[PDB]
Symmetry: C3
Subunit: 304 residues, 3 copies
């Protein structure tokens, strides 16, 4: 029972949740970080609608945590652009307190989705353990949010700029299911495969939804990662994308890029080295994840 001053859920989204319609949450750190970003966010939403679900994009607008955004608010974040704060769990109180706009990471989008009672969240890729984290301790707060918050996150696996092995160990220690959708191999984000394997392979949205129900009815708190391979036709060739990522990582280290700036810097550089191709792949994987997320949301509402 949080104050309407802090949190506001759109009329459509309230309506949908009351009527037990499937809702899929979306993050805003994709929209920030124009007027392309806006149009694209709006058609991720329309993709969800065409899959028979209701999209809810989450962001902080004028200090208010908002679940479901008008096209005007979407626009606002789009044009305000890089001036928008990237908001993780530790940033969230300050942006709200100060009455500012903010774009939510995987972690804070999970937080707000859970406040609104939304169990399914579609994104591109989750944060994770950064390469070199054995000596830097640079580990995304996303992984702790997954440890603790009851939301299924549908992604292309963790972002492949990270250390995927360490990320899978970390997920295991903290008891977070890593589900391959129709895959045993952990998808590489831009790529379909990787040297690492998910914790369980499941072939149907129905199985995932049933597992969500069981997990939470049994009081095992925390989220689920659903790793969904990018469609083959949009995947990056392993060698090319690997070279680009490796060079970007090396440059980030050499340039002292650290903290919240690491991921956006890496993604932007990789786009540069691949001539925008990695970006096209990123878009395709996000649509793909929105579709799957919609199916899981439908089956979850059916099973609960």
């Amino acid at each position: 029972k949080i104050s309407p001053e802090l949190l506001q859920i759109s009329p459509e989204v309230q309506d949908a949740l009351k009527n037990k319609k499937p809702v899929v949450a979306l993050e805003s750190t994709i929209i920030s970080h124009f007027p392309q970003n806006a149009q694209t966010a709006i058609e991720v939403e329309e993709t969800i609608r065409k899959q028979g679900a209701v999209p809810a994009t989450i962001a902080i607008i004028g200090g208010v945590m908002k679940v479901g955004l008008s096209k005007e608010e979407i626009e606002l974040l789009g044009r305000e652009g890089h001036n928008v704060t990237k908001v993780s769990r530790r940033d969230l109180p300050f942006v709200v307190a100060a009455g500012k706009n903010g774009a939510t990471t995987v972690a804070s989008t999970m937080i707000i989705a859970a406040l609104a009672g939304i169990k399914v969240f579609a994104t591109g890729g989750i944060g994770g353990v950064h390469r070199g984290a054995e000596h830097t301790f640079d580990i995304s707060a996303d992984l702790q949010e997954l440890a603790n918050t009851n939301v299924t996150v549908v992604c292309a696996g963790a972002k492949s700029i990270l250390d995927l092995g360490l990320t899978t160990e970390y997920l295991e220690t903290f008891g977070v299911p890593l589900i391959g959708y129709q895959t045993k191999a952990l998808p590489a984000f831009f790529c379909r495969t990787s040297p690492f394997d998910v914790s369980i392979r499941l072939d149907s949205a129905s199985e995932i939804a049933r597992a969500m129900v069981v997990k939470w009815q049994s009081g095992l708190n925390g989220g689920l990662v659903v790793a969904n391979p990018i469609p083959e036709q949009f995947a990056m060739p392993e060698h090319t994308i690997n070279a680009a990522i490796d060079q970007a990582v090396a440059e980030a280290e050499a340039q002292g890029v650290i903290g919240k700036e690491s991921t956006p810097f890496l993604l932007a550089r990789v786009a540069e080295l691949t001539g925008g191709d990695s970006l096209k792949s990123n878009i395709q994987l996000v649509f793909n994840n929105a579709i799957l997320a919609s199916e899981i949301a439908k089956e979850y509402q059916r099973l609960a």
Copy 2:
């Protein structure tokens, strides 16, 4: 929680409702134990041992998708017979085995989880998982440690195997605020061995003192479990110098990933002649006795 998800056997139900002391047991001892029909028989004997101590045993497992607190003879027999075909169930595995109606053997973490759902505060096992050697670069860290950080259950064990990294494990437990109690020992015992190069966080000499501390801990709202490291009886114990000699040797030989830990297990086994299974059975009986005592005293004090 739904009876379709979780079922407590009539015996354990009666014990709980009447406030009789209950001790949880894991099921991986049955599936991964001696060849049937011995693994079954043994699990049965551990239960009987708990009853003779004046406690009610609850063996925990997943049978046909149901989390089961306490088992019948035929469930135990079924797990024994299915043997290694039964999957070991961790926290991240639990929902899926249950959803899919599978059988499964519960690990330390999953047994703590299910016990806690049943309101059982004491769990007797052989050993706990820990931080693995090389975890500083592999991040391979047992989920048991996080379960201990979060779930209110006292796990009576022989500590963790010396094949793990015990220094890192003791640090990890301190960071997460988990008591490591030596039972009548300052030295941290490890599996085969009554001692090791590391210390517990506190030594306590009685079941009643451990119970008293559990009561203060949870009445003060400090959630999370407790490790009670109980040295293997001298009769079954192995000298620390030989065990350490063997491990150092096996780790020197391994030097020249996922194969590291069990490689060390097998090698140390070969070198010392130590037998993991037999030793573990001994550990479970011993810990089952201590655990029954702690459960009785806790029941008294709460």
Copy 3:
């Protein structure tokens, strides 16, 4: 919670009942800080600083097995006389010291726990524990960081104790979603020094802003504490090079003697003090923190 476990002094009960701002203080600085009578004198002087700021101090300790929130002069003197005979009490120690009827000095972590049990939201200390130098191979990481992750108390400090690894500590706090607020500073102060190569998560210039963010954070269900890093007053600051030399020596030698455990911080601060031969600065940063904490408590109580 039973009166047998936890007792709140009349002064503090009065304050809580009448909605007066309360600031918690630790006991470990008392027992393990310096020699008697000076240690007890200083403790009482810190309490008086708080009172002068118009807040009410609550020094916390375990006395005769009881968790005490607010202490008598007699009790502070007891802890001061006993000095190092008094056990340093962490979260994993607390149940056993209470059960055994023992006296004990509470760490940052245990002080947070007991303060929270009493509804006290603001705690002034010298510096927080953190990730130790070499923690990448030793895993020596203060339980203070986990307490900050989980317990709802704002801790006003001069940053982390500076014998620690500040880089690893800042990454750790970020992973676990803990705000690190610089009070009128973006650079993270390092204990004796006003600045360091590292940054806080957000700079805030007023106690009012800090309080408003506390209310928003906890009303939004984001449990966990907040670190407020308050640079030592310029007149008491120590030159980076000199202090860094001493600290360097003390650490290298702590590794030489091989002290690893809870005795590490006491040993370190000891040796460094010796080479300093630092204590003046430590006392003054504590007073400074007590003053800021009093203001934060006033602003927070005003809202709560």
